[PDB]
Paper text:
We identify a horizontally transferred T6SS with Ntox15 family nuclease effector (Tde1) that mediates interbacterial antagonism among Bacteroidales, including several derived from a single human donor. Effectors with novel toxin 15 (Ntox15) DNAse domains, also known as toxin_43 domains, degrade recipient genomic DNA. Cognate immunity proteins are encoded adjacent to T6SS effectors and neutralize their activity to prevent intoxication of self and kin. Crystallographic snapshots of isolated Tde1, the Tde1/Tdi1 complex, and homologs from Phocaeicola vulgatus (Tde2/Tdi2) illustrate a conserved mechanism of immunity inserting into the central core of Tde, splitting the nuclease fold into two subdomains.
Tde1tox exhibited DNAse activity on plasmid dsDNA, which was abrogated by mutation of the HxxD active site (H279A) and strongly inhibited by the presence of Tdi1 or chelation of divalent cations using EDTA. A structural model of Tde1tox H279A/D282A Ntox15 domain was obtained by X-ray crystallography with diffraction data extending to 2.9 Å resolution. Although no close homologs of known structure were available, phases were solved by molecular replacement using an AlphaFold2 prediction model. The AlphaFold2 prediction model was very similar to the experimental crystal structure; mean Cα r.m.s.d. among the eight monomers in the asymmetric unit was 1.0 Å. The Ntox15 domain adopts a globular fold which is predominantly α-helical, forming a short α-sheet between helices 5 and 6 immediately adjacent to the active site. A cavity adjacent to the mutated HxxD motif marks the active site. A sulfate ion is modeled within the active site, likely an artifact of crystallization in high concentration of ammonium sulfate. The DNA binding site predicted with ProNA2020 (38) maps to helices 4, 6, and 7, adjacent to the active site. Coulombic surface rendering highlights relative positive surface charge surrounding the active site pocket, consistent with favorable electrostatics for interaction with negatively charged DNA. We conclude that Ntox15 domains adopt a globular fold, distinct from other nuclease families of known structure, with a structurally well-defined active site that mediates DNAse activity.
Author numbering: 172 to 355
Amino acid sequence: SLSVIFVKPPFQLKKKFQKDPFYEIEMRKQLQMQQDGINNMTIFEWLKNRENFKKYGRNPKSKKIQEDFRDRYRNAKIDEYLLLYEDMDIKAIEAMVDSELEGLAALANPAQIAGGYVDVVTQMGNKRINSSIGSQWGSIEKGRSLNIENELLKLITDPPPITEEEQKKIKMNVNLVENLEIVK
């Protein structure tokens, strides 16, 4: 196993998300899923994805994966609502579902700057709370995602070091949710 890496600086619940209590709940939900997404990968895996994202950029395949899911999810929800509430006015249901989907985004767990190069999409989440996380991950040259890689390198290079062979068998171990910082 490995020592926990806490994200530095902590993620922030910005001013405009403090009004409605749903946003706090969602930010934890979303940071969790991104956390779980990293801790599912191996040290070598994560470090490669970050290597590639830095060297070649965003993966064009991922936007298509996501829109394809939206389209499925849209139709899936319509059927759920048709059959659950007995409204056969599929145009009404379609209107309603499309409202919901306006403030929803396919969730890349984790984002691509944060080592999720080839993500498989399966859940929807608040588009804005998702874009807050996404910018707070920072840039390649500076930010929270960088601070995770640097700390993770010191861990593997300090003695007794970790070879690629052992990198491929130790899973990531970050925490993005304990220290969530509510702006004051």
